[PDB]
Scaffold this active site. Structure first.
Site, mmCIF file in Angstrom:
data_model
loop_
_atom_site.group_PDB
_atom_site.id
_atom_site.type_symbol
_atom_site.label_atom_id
_atom_site.label_comp_id
_atom_site.label_asym_id
_atom_site.label_seq_id
_atom_site.Cartn_x
_atom_site.Cartn_y
_atom_site.Cartn_z
ATOM 1 N N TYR A 41 0.825 -1.207 0.000
ATOM 2 C CA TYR A 41 0.000 0.000 0.000
ATOM 3 C C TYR A 41 0.851 1.245 0.000
ATOM 4 O O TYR A 41 1.995 1.237 0.444
ATOM 5 C CB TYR A 41 -0.967 0.003 1.197
ATOM 6 C CG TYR A 41 -0.284 0.260 2.530
ATOM 7 C CD1 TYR A 41 -0.172 1.535 3.057
ATOM 8 C CD2 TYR A 41 0.258 -0.769 3.258
ATOM 9 C CE1 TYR A 41 0.469 1.779 4.273
ATOM 10 C CE2 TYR A 41 0.873 -0.550 4.470
ATOM 11 C CZ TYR A 41 0.987 0.729 4.981
ATOM 12 O OH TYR A 41 1.628 0.883 6.194
ATOM 13 N N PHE A 51 2.002 9.718 3.646
ATOM 14 C CA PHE A 51 2.229 9.507 5.070
ATOM 15 C C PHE A 51 2.874 8.158 5.387
ATOM 16 O O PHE A 51 3.525 8.004 6.385
ATOM 17 C CB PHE A 51 0.969 9.731 5.918
ATOM 18 C CG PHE A 51 -0.208 8.878 5.573
ATOM 19 C CD1 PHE A 51 -0.312 7.596 6.083
ATOM 20 C CD2 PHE A 51 -1.218 9.351 4.765
ATOM 21 C CE1 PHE A 51 -1.416 6.823 5.784
ATOM 22 C CE2 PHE A 51 -2.326 8.593 4.478
ATOM 23 C CZ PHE A 51 -2.418 7.300 4.955
ATOM 24 N N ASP A 52 2.685 7.168 4.528
ATOM 25 C CA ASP A 52 3.254 5.838 4.743
ATOM 26 C C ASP A 52 3.126 4.988 3.497
ATOM 27 O O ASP A 52 2.228 5.182 2.702
ATOM 28 C CB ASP A 52 2.545 5.115 5.885
ATOM 29 C CG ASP A 52 3.362 3.970 6.450
ATOM 30 O OD1 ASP A 52 4.601 4.087 6.472
ATOM 31 O OD2 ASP A 52 2.748 2.994 6.898
ATOM 32 N N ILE A 71 -7.775 0.138 10.542
ATOM 33 C CA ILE A 71 -8.925 1.028 10.427
ATOM 34 C C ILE A 71 -10.094 0.369 9.711
ATOM 35 O O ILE A 71 -9.935 -0.523 8.875
ATOM 36 C CB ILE A 71 -8.561 2.352 9.718
ATOM 37 C CG1 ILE A 71 -7.975 2.142 8.317
ATOM 38 C CG2 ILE A 71 -7.590 3.143 10.573
ATOM 39 C CD1 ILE A 71 -7.794 3.411 7.521
ATOM 40 N N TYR A 97 -9.178 7.706 11.224
ATOM 41 C CA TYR A 97 -8.718 8.201 12.535
ATOM 42 C C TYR A 97 -9.557 9.337 13.128
ATOM 43 O O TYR A 97 -9.189 9.889 14.158
ATOM 44 C CB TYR A 97 -7.204 8.542 12.475
ATOM 45 C CG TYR A 97 -6.343 7.328 12.244
ATOM 46 C CD1 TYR A 97 -5.898 6.582 13.307
ATOM 47 C CD2 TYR A 97 -6.024 6.878 10.940
ATOM 48 C CE1 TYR A 97 -5.162 5.434 13.103
ATOM 49 C CE2 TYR A 97 -5.289 5.708 10.728
ATOM 50 C CZ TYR A 97 -4.870 4.986 11.813
ATOM 51 O OH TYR A 97 -4.151 3.810 11.578
ATOM 52 N N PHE A 114 -5.676 5.643 -0.138
ATOM 53 C CA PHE A 114 -4.764 4.502 -0.275
ATOM 54 C C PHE A 114 -4.796 3.920 -1.666
ATOM 55 O O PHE A 114 -5.849 3.842 -2.299
ATOM 56 C CB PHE A 114 -5.117 3.378 0.684
ATOM 57 C CG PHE A 114 -4.906 3.704 2.124
ATOM 58 C CD1 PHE A 114 -3.686 3.500 2.741
ATOM 59 C CD2 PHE A 114 -5.953 4.200 2.905
ATOM 60 C CE1 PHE A 114 -3.499 3.771 4.090
ATOM 61 C CE2 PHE A 114 -5.771 4.483 4.263
ATOM 62 C CZ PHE A 114 -4.547 4.267 4.849
#
Ligand SMILES: COc1ccc(OCCN2C[C@H]([C@@H](O)CO)[C@H]3CCC[C@@H](C2=O)N3S(=O)(=O)c2cc(Cl)cc(Cl)c2)cc1OC
Length: 123
Positions: A41, A51-52, A71, A97, A114
């Site tokens: 991902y 972010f990641d 999540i 979140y 994502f």
């Protein structure tokens, strides 16, 4: 229920998780609840900031589907995927979140975007 921003895959049809298929899987079944799922991902905020990403670690992200290890948007979204599939998932904060976020990486009230590839899954 297909919007301009993708298919609403929520049970409530509340527009909270929207999916666009980028590459169709040749896999036939979706993973089942409790399966060990392997994905790649990349996650970005609405400002485009990554972010990641698992790709940046050069190994897959692994979790047990439908067990609340991720999540809500992911337990919903990954459950729709077949092996080999790549999708984009738009995840409103209520499926991610929320108002608190998870600083520093995730701001308050953040829609998450994502790109997810379902690599494999095992029961
Ligand atoms: C049952 O509800 C939750 C369960 C887990 C949870 O967050 C921890 C798991 N997690 C973090 C992973 C990885 O960073 C763990 O190594 C990651 C991929 C799976 C989805 C989601 C993710 O759900 N995240 S994330 O990309 O949104 C993320 C990355 C980073 Cl660096 C930091 C955060 Cl806070 C989130 C958050 C949850 O509710 C807000």
């Amino acid at each position: 229920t297909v919007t301009e921003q993708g298919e609403d895959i929520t049970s409530k049809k509340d527009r909270g998780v929207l999916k666009i298929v980028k590459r169709v899987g040749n896999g036939e079944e979706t993973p089942m609840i409790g399966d060990k799922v392997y994905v790649h991902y990349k996650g970005k905020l609405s400002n485009g900031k990554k972010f990641d990403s698992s790709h940046d670690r050069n190994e897959p992200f692994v979790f047990s589907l439908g067990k609340g290890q991720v999540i809500k948007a992911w337990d919903i979204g990954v459950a729709t995927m077949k092996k080999g599939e790549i999708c984009h998932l738009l995840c409103k904060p209520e499926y991610a979140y929320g108002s608190a976020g998870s600083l520093p990486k995730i701001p308050s009230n953040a829609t998450l975007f994502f790109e997810i590839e379902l690599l494999d899954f095992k029961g």
